[PDB]
């Protein structure tokens, strides 16, 4: 049994909580570098310009060790987003890849911010049934 | 074995020619509807508006039977291209998803034209070694 699929994650509940697991896809984890640990359904066209589309399954390596410039999955106060990282102190800036979208600015003092993992690829399949 | 990886196809040669296959990927074919028969490397940003970026692997179901509005892999006199199909009689239009590319218009009477398959999805891993 292979990569889990996570959809809408509950506010203040771990991402890979069974309740969020919408299935197990048989894809070689090691086809991604580093290893894909799970797949997250992408909501919205924030990242349309790098090729991450609504409904896409983002192949994510579970880690907190991410460097600036990378595309990461981040939780800002009970909301999970897929953006490009630009941290500079207690000012983290989650940048999009779509002109219609404007950077998110998180102030680590005021809000909760965690890094759920690193984007390592994309699977776009449909409903298959 | 797994899903074959078709790269750049030499003129005249069939897609799955043994010396076009640069690997086999262990992805569950039935994760795509209909089945993924092979993965073709996308070359160009001719399709980027729908998330088919350069270096992406396109999941293709080997058919000649495709309807209008679908993303197809086609051959126009040995030019393996990935476009959207709009056929009106003997006027086949291969439309791109990019405002910098102009449609390909094919007169079936004049040009040789083959539908190689149906786009059934996208796998975007990088180099994994």
């Amino acid at each position, epitope marked *: 049994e292979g990569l889990p699929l996570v959809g809408r994650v509950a506010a203040g509940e771990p991402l890979l909580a069974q309740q969020h697991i919408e299935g197990h896809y048989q894809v*070689d*984890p*090691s*086809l991604f*570098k*580093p*290893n894909a*640990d799970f797949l997250l359904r992408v909501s919205g066209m924030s990242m349309k310009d790098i090729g991450i589309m609504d409904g896409d399954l983002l192949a994510v390596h*579970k*880690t907190q*060790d991410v460097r600036n410039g990378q595309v990461v999955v981040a939780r800002i106060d009970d909301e999970v987003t897929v953006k490009r990282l630009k941290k500079q102190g207690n000012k983290v800036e989650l940048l999009p890849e779509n002109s219609e979208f404007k950077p998110i600015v998180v102030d680590l003092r005021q809000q909760s911010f965690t890094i759920e993992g690193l984007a390592v690829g994309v699977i776009r399949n449909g409903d298959w049934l | 074995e*797994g899903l074959p*990886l078709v*790269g*750049r196809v030499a003129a005249g040669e069939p897609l799955l020619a*043994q*010396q*076009h*296959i*640069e*690997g*086999h*990927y*262990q992805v569950d074919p039935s994760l795509f509807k209909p089945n993924a028969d092979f993965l073709l490397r996308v070359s160009g940003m001719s399709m980027k508006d729908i998330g088919i970026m350069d270096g992406d692997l396109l999941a293709v179901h080997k058919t000649q039977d495709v309807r209008n509005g679908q993303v197809v892999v086609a051959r126009i006199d040995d030019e393996v291209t990935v476009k959207r199909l709009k056929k009106q009689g003997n006027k086949v239009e291969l439309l791109p998803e990019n405002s910098e590319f102009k449609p390909i218009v094919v007169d079936l009477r004049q040009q040789s034209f083959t539908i190689e398959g149906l786009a059934v999805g996208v796998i975007r891993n990088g*180099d*994994w*070694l």
Partner: nanobody
Amino acid sequence: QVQLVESGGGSVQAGGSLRLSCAASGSIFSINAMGWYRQAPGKQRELVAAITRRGSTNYADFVKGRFTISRDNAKNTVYLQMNSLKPEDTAVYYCKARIEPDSSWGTEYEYWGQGTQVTV
């Protein structure tokens, strides 16, 4: 400590069939992908052939169905059968591997072999 042990390689003429192998040893939690790169004097390091634990494989644009990468999960080994060799294939073939070592589960590091001369 993780180590990569190479064997195979040597001299051959046009055509022929040389066989490489590389084997990981030490405190390994998982091997995610083993494979081979080649360095030809003066140009850059190029990937030759990769293979994952569950058997996915990938080949460079210059190997046109002449090389065949294999794995032996028990022997923690990887093999490269290369036939139909060419002058332009001459290079040093370095083994490469992605390993999660015992210490760091979930963190993965790239490990390299010492290199093998392959002359055509």
